[PDB]
Amino acid sequence: ATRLDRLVTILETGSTRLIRDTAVNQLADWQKQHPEELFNLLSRVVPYLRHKDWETRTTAAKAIGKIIENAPLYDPNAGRPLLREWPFERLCEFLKVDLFDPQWETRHGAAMGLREVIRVHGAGAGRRRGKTRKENNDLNRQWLDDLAYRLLCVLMLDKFTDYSSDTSVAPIRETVGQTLGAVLRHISVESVHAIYRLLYCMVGMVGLRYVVAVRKDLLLQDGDMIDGVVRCVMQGLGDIDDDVRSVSAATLIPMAKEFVMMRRSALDSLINIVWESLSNLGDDLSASTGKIMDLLATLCSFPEVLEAMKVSASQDEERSFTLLVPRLYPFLRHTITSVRLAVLKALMTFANLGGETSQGWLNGRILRLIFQNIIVERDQDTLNMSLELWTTLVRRLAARDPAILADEFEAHAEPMMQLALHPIGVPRHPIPMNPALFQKPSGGTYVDGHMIQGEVDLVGVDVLIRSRISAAKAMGLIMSFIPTPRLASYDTAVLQALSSPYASTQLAAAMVIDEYAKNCSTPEVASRFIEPLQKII
Amino acid sequence: SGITPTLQNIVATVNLDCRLDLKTIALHARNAEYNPKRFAAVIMRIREPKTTALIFASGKMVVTGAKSEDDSKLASRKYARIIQKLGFNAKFTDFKIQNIVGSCDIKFPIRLEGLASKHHNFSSYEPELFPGLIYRMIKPKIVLLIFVSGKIVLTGAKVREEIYQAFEMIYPVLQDFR
DNA sequence: GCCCTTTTATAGGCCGCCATGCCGGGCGCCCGGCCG
DNA sequence: CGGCCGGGCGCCCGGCATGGCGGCCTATAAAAGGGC
């Protein structure tokens, strides 16, 4: 057997990803050294595109792309639903003839391979030897139009979706969209007009994601072909279904930069629709709010959007940040983890804006809600993001004045000290916290019932202990920032906790003292807690 | 009293109140398998919380594999949502947990033969066929499989307190035999 | 019978394999002799 | 006393094909809902 037979099998039987990456690199270098035998490699790598394994198909597509990248460029002149010469002409035809195969794996591989081939060699497609230059250019236009037409027909007929996770995934739609994005780089603007007319601005959206984001600099400010897409996206954002909302939000986020640059006028309507859609409390099981908040964070990150938002609060404060961003607070305790993480990340992006707007909504309300998040969270990632947001908020609030931090959180400090220094029970005999200590996002008093009740049997003791140490870190930091004369209630609370009849509360008090000592400017400040600890040991 | 059982499986039934075309579910959802010769339902799956759903043509479904009541209810709601997305007018109705399984490990071996001899009216033991003593309890209606290693699994419960009561009832007996 | 989930776990039967031969035919070894 | 002696018998050869241990492999056990 030759080296190639053993080298191709690594793409399927490779023990690790680096081994398969090295296999494709070696195969590409092989084609480079022996340019006369592209078909030998292609005939052995192409059959993997219809393999059942996902990773094998992806690796085969990457191998085909890297093999083809080393061959010379070509220039011979001088409604049935989908459910579960040009040198590469026969390869592309074999991909297109099973692009409508019933099995979804074959379609996935066909789309990936067509993307990879056209990505490097789309310019020379469709031409035939012996024809004139201009007529061959017309033939290339015909070929690219045919490929775009067939791919768009595939997009409008495929309904295969995966519901394993909250965010539904359409593999064939995504691959076909990337294929359109590969195709549309080389065509002339007349074919771009034709494709924009074919994918009419109505609500496809995943198709729009790559019908724009290609030839981007020329589509910008191009009249209707850029004015209609914003209408289509805005209509999608206000639609009822969560799926179309999520897809539209994910389609606008990578294009947010040039859609912002397209007009200053469109920003008002866009941010209005985004905030209006986020204001309505979505359905409990929807992951779309995460995409909506990612879109909001990305849009607010650009300077001109900040200028537009500052301009918007002209006649009143209704559209200002201070009144609006509390609309994100209800989603802090949403059932789906992605929404909670998105809320925290968007709030961190807003906090790191500066520009004298952050002082508006930064107050004791958000601090207390984030402390409740720390206490009642079970997911590690959301807990980490919550503590990061807490640290950033406390640091920003102490940037203005330590007195502002000290008296803003003074209203809330004692109940949060009760929560942080709360005991932990045994499995069948919990020691529940008082629900009156927890605030609602839009209410004075309170999904998180198990953590509040202290049910160790239903939520593991590790989770409770981790919540306690996280609360200790947060409260130690906020003790450290605020001035010493204001710490009377804090210090007497921990001192009384150090003498409690409970075991868990003493541990929490020691943890709070340790974190306060760690975060201080110098260790000597916390010396008032010396002798109680020596009495403990 | 001592240690507490850990729940291992909860089975819930929920009625979607609408007829379903199973093959249309299978052809569209990646996470669904349908084999009408083997079984009459589509076996859907989701990865948070890890559960499986036997969704039938009559609109009923059986959701299994959950480790808690809230997880089971949330998974049933997610499956109802998934059926709604595929076009059917499924509505979450008639939820009721119908089995809970638990497992515990007391830290000493058990003399199964003496236990079977003394409690013959409430137990069965055929070591040639199955290496665990079977115990059937009348008051909480729980069935316990007792093993020489000191591990007991309880089944048939419809509430957590039932397995807790069954373990409390059985623990003195296991203490008596080593 | 048929299927889904879950923690527990080990000992009977079923399909195989596997050494059993046992008559002549030969070789090689050590174990008994003796021969000039 | 040294050296060649016969001499026995354990070892291996080979066939077909039968009976007795095998390991290994479901099946064993429990709850329950649904439909066929």
Q: Do A160 and B46 touch (CB under 8 A)?
A: no
Alpha carbon of residue A335 to chain centroid: 17
Q: What is the dihedral of CA A48, A53, A57, A58, to 10 degrees?
A: -150
Residues 6+ apart with CB under 8 A from A128: A76, A85, A86, A136, A139
How was this entry determined? Answer: cryo-EM
Gaps (C–N > 2.5 Å) in chain A: which residues precede them? 78, 84, 203, 446
Chain A residues with CB under 8 Å of B30 CB are 84, 104, 160-164, 171
> Using the 8-state DSSP alphabet, how is residue A162 labeled?
B
Q: How far is B125 from chain A (nearest CA, A)?
A: 32
Q: How many Å apart are CA A122 and CA A146, to the nearest integer?
A: 13
Best CA proximity match to A293, nearest among A319, A274, A269: A274
Half-sphere exposure of B41 (CA within 13 A, CB side): 14
Any atom of strand C under 7 A from CB of B13? no
Q: How many Å apart are CA A395 and CA A389, to the nearest integer?
A: 10
Q: How many Å apart are CA A322 and CA A251, to the nearest integer?
A: 28
Helical ranges in chain B per DSSP H: 22-28, 69-85, 112-118, 160-176
Q: How many Å apart are CA B108 and CA B151, to the nearest integer?
A: 9
Any atom of strand D under 7 A from CB of B134? yes
Best CA proximity match to A226, nearest among A237, A235, A217: A217
Helical ranges in A125-264 per DSSP H: 133-155, 171-183, 189-198, 205-211, 216-219, 224-237, 242-262
Structure tokens at B47: 């990865």
Instruction: Assign A439 to helix, strand or coil.
Output: coil
Structure tokens at A240: 């009822």
Written as one letter, the residue type at A123 is A
Name the region of A215 (left: φ>0; alpha: ψ -120 to 50; beta: rest).
Answer: left
Neighbours of A227 (CB within 10 A): 14
Gaps (C–N > 2.5 Å) in chain B: which residues precede them? none
> Using the 8-state DSSP alphabet, how is residue A432 labeled?
P
Residue showing tokens 């080393």: A70
| A336 φ/ψ angles, rounded to the nearest 5 degrees | -80, 135
Any atom of strand D under 7 A from CB of B64? yes
**Are B83 and B55 in contact, with CB atoms under 8 Å apart?**
yes
Interface membership of A335 toward B (CB under 8 Å): yes
Name the region of B94 (left: φ>0; alpha: ψ -120 to 50; beta: rest).
Answer: left
Chain B residues with CB under 8 Å of A160 CB are 28, 30
Q: How many Å apart are CA B161 and CA B53, to the nearest integer?
A: 26
Q: How many Å apart are CA A54 and CA A151, to the nearest integer?
A: 21
Question: Quick one: resolution in A?
Answer: 2.8
Mapped to the 3 state alphabet, what secondary structure does B51-94 carry? EEEEECCCCEEEEEEECCHHHHHHHHHHHHHHHHHCCCCCCCEE
Q: How many Å apart are CA A429 and CA A483, to the nearest integer?
A: 40
Classify residue B145 by burial, with Cβ atoms within 10 Å: 0-12, 13-18, 19+. middle
Q: Which of B24, B81, B84, B164 to mutate to test the interface with A (most CBs of A within 10 A)?
A: B81
Alpha carbon of residue A497 to chain centroid: 42
Q: How many Å apart are CA A7 and CA A31, to the nearest integer?
A: 13
3-state helix, strand, coil in chain A (%, to 5): 70, 0, 30
Q: How many Å apart are CA A523 and CA A526, to the nearest integer?
A: 6
Q: How many Å apart are CA A164 and CA A171, to the nearest integer?
A: 13
Structure tokens at B87: 């076009």
Classify residue A63 by burial, with Cβ atoms within 10 Å: 0-12, 13-18, 19+. buried
How many angstroms separate the Cα of A208 from the Cα of each of A168, A183, A214, A222, A379? Answer: 18, 14, 10, 16, 35
ω into B49 cis (within 30 of 0): yes
Sign of CA dihedral B171, B172, B177, B178: positive
Q: How many Å apart are CA A61 and CA A45, to the nearest integer?
A: 8
Q: Which residues of A154-190 are buried (b: 16+ CB within 10 A; e: fewer)?
A: bbbebbbbebbebbbebbbbebbbbbbbbbbebbeee
**Residues written for chain A:** 537
Residue showing tokens 């310019």: A123
**Are B28 and A160 in contact, with CB atoms under 8 Å apart?**
yes
Interface membership of A222 toward B (CB under 8 Å): no
Residues 6+ apart with CB under 8 A from A460: none
Structure tokens at A405: 């931090």
Residues 6+ apart with CB under 8 A from A56: A11, A12, A48
Q: How many Å apart are CA B159 and CA B100, to the nearest integer?
A: 7
Interface membership of A103 toward B (CB under 8 Å): no
**Are B55 and B84 in contact, with CB atoms under 8 Å apart?**
no
* Helical pair A17-33 and A54-68, crossing angle rounded to 10 deg: 30
- Out of B4, B28, B82, name the one closest to residue A160 (CB): B28
Residues 6+ apart with CB under 8 A from B149: B105, B109
Q: How many Å apart are CA A247 and CA A369, to the nearest integer?
A: 30
Neighbours of A10 (CB within 10 A): 19
Q: How many Å apart are CA A288 and CA A240, to the nearest integer?
A: 11
Instruction: Assign A154 to helix, strand or coil.
Output: helix
Any atom of strand D under 7 A from CB of B22? no
Interface membership of A285 toward B (CB under 8 Å): yes
Q: Which nucleotides of D are covered by protein (CB under 7 A)?
A: 28-36
Q: Which nucleotides of C are covered by protein (CB under 7 A)?
A: 2-12
Q: How many Å apart are CA A205 and CA A249, to the nearest integer?
A: 10
Q: How many Å apart are CA A217 and CA B170, to the nearest integer?
A: 76
Sign of CA dihedral B30, B35, B38, B42: positive
Q: Which long-range contacts (CB under 8 A, 24 or more apart) does A131-136 make?
A: A131/A77, A132/A77, A133/A77, A133/A78, A136/A76, A136/A77
Q: How many Å apart are CA A472 and CA B100, to the nearest integer?
A: 37
Q: How many Å apart are CA A304 and CA A300, to the nearest integer?
A: 9
Best CA proximity match to B159, nearest among B10, B2, B1, B8: B10
Instruction: Assign A122 to helix, strand or coil.
Output: coil
Smallest CA–CA distance from A338 into chain B, residue: B48
**Are A136 and A199 in contact, with CB atoms under 8 Å apart?**
no
Best CA proximity match to A148, nearest among A89, A207, A200: A207
Structure tokens at B113: 């033969």
**Are B25 and B86 in contact, with CB atoms under 8 Å apart?**
yes
Written as one letter, the residue type at A367 is L
> Using the 8-state DSSP alphabet, how is residue A169 labeled?
B
Q: How many Å apart are CA A495 and CA A523, to the nearest integer?
A: 19
Task: Please give residues of chain B from 44 to 83 whose alpha-adjacent beta carbon (CB) lies under 7 Å from any atom of strand C.
Answer: 50, 52, 54, 62, 64-65
Written as one letter, the residue type at A457 is D
Q: How many Å apart are CA A164 and CA B52, to the nearest integer?
A: 11
Best CA proximity match to A333, nearest among A452, A247, A418: A452
Best CA proximity match to A411, nearest among A489, A514, A318: A489
Residue showing tokens 């020489």: B148
Q: Do A159 and B45 touch (CB under 8 A)?
A: no
Q: How many Å apart are CA A190 and CA B54, to the nearest integer?
A: 52
Q: How far is B30 from chain A (nearest CA, A)?
A: 5
**Are A304 and A267 in contact, with CB atoms under 8 Å apart?**
yes
Best CA proximity match to A42, nearest among A58, A20, A59, A64: A64
Closest nucleotide to B6 by C1' from CA? C7
Pairing of strands B50-55, B42-47: antiparallel
Measured distance between the N- and C-terminal CA atoms of chain B, rounded to whole angstroms = 16
- Out of A161, A243, A284, name the one closest to residue B28 (CB): A161
Best CA proximity match to B5, nearest among B103, B79, B100: B103
Structure tokens at A421: 């220094």
Any atom of strand D under 7 A from CB of B173? no
Neighbours of A132 (CB within 10 A): 9
Half-sphere exposure of A116 (CA within 13 A, CB side): 25
Give the residues across from B53 on adjacent strands.
Answer: B44, B63
Instruction: Assign A311 to helix, strand or coil.
Output: helix
**Are A378 and A386 in contact, with CB atoms under 8 Å apart?**
no
Q: How many Å apart are CA A493 and CA A218, to the nearest integer?
A: 65
> Using the 8-state DSSP alphabet, how is residue A524 labeled?
G
